Every structure is written in structure tokens, then in C-alpha cells.
Design a protein around this ligand. Structure first.
Ligand code: NI
Length: 159
């Protein structure tokens, strides 16, 4: 179990470094992953990025409309067309708040699994939204910085 960092921490705002090749397959990486799944499961989250626990690595985990349990390294996202869709987001680093955010409806995402094998998936809707949100942590973007409709940004208890 690790502490989740909160919005305002400078560590959330950095561009994350890639997982280096010598870590792929390794026990050190596996332990980071186990620590991340424990943390996410302990607070009831659907996704967690390594910078949210102060680890400066392009590594996200997610899973749950169901979403397959995935561990994604060094990701690259390619929007499949121009269609945008609005949805509710929250984040463990932004407790007590929700906002509506416009995201690509369809994306292809690519990256590596923990053993260094390629991932290549094309996805839509909520799965697409989750991946965009997690991958935004890796470039120092939290979901308030993506909001366009501020009428829909508020406290959970109130909205
Ligand atoms: Ni988040």
C-alpha cells in the first residue's frame, strides 16, 4: 500500500519517464504492479497511474460497462475519428469532486504489458475514457485541466 497524491502535488504535474527496457519482465516491476493493485483495490478505484503514488513511470493500471484488468506501459493513444463524447469523471487525487469532460469516443491504444509484449487495442466509450484519463496522468494532466463546461464541475455531495 502507497499513499495517493493529491492535486497540488508537483509530482502529479510532471511528464513521466518511460519504463526502461531492463525493468520489463523483472521482479522489481512486478512488485510495483502488486503495490499499485493493492492501493487501487483498498480505495475502490477503477484506475491508477504510477505518478499518483509518486513513481515517475509511464505505467497505468485499470479495470472494472466492464473494462478488462490491464497493466499498460509506455502508452501511445491515437484518436480513431473526431467524435467527442461527454461523461462524468472523478479521480482519487481529486477527492470529493466530479466533472464532465469531453473525450475522444474511439481510440486505438498501444503500449507494452509487463513482460514487454505489445498491446494494441481499439476501444470506444467508457473503456476509451478510462484509458485517456489514465494516460493524461503520464503527461501531468488532471481532469479539471480538460473541462470545458464548468457548470458541470462540482462537489460530489452537491452534484
Ligand atoms: Ni485520476
Amino acid at each position: 500500500i502507497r499513499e495517493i497524491l493529491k492535486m497540488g502535488d508537483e509530482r502529479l504535474l510532471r511528464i513521466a519517464q518511460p519504463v526502461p527496457s531492463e525493468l520489463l519482465g523483472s521482479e522489481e516491476l512486478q512488485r510495483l504492479i502488486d503495490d499499485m493493485f493493492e492501493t487501487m483495490h483498498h480505495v475502490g478505484g477503477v484506475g491508477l497511474a504510477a505518478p499518483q503514488i509518486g513513481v515517475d513511470l509511464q505505467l497505468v493500471i485499470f479495470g472494472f460497462p466492464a473494462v478488462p484488468p490491464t497493466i499498460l506501459l509506455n502508452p501511445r493513444i491515437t484518436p480513431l475519428d473526431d467524435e467527442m463524447e461527454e461523461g462524468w469523471e472523478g479521480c482519487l487525487s481529486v477527492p470529493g469532486l466530479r466533472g464532465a469532460v469531453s473525450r475522444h469516443r474511439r481510440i486505438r491504444y498501444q503500449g507494452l504489458d509487463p513482460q514487454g509484449q505489445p498491446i494494441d487495442r481499439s476501444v470506444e466509450g467508457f473503456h476509451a475514457r478510462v484509458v485517456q484519463h489514465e494516460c493524461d496522468h503520464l503527461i501531468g494532466r488532471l481532469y479539471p485541466s480538460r473541462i470545458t463546461d464548468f457548470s458541470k464541475f462540482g462537489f460530489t455531495e452537491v452534484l
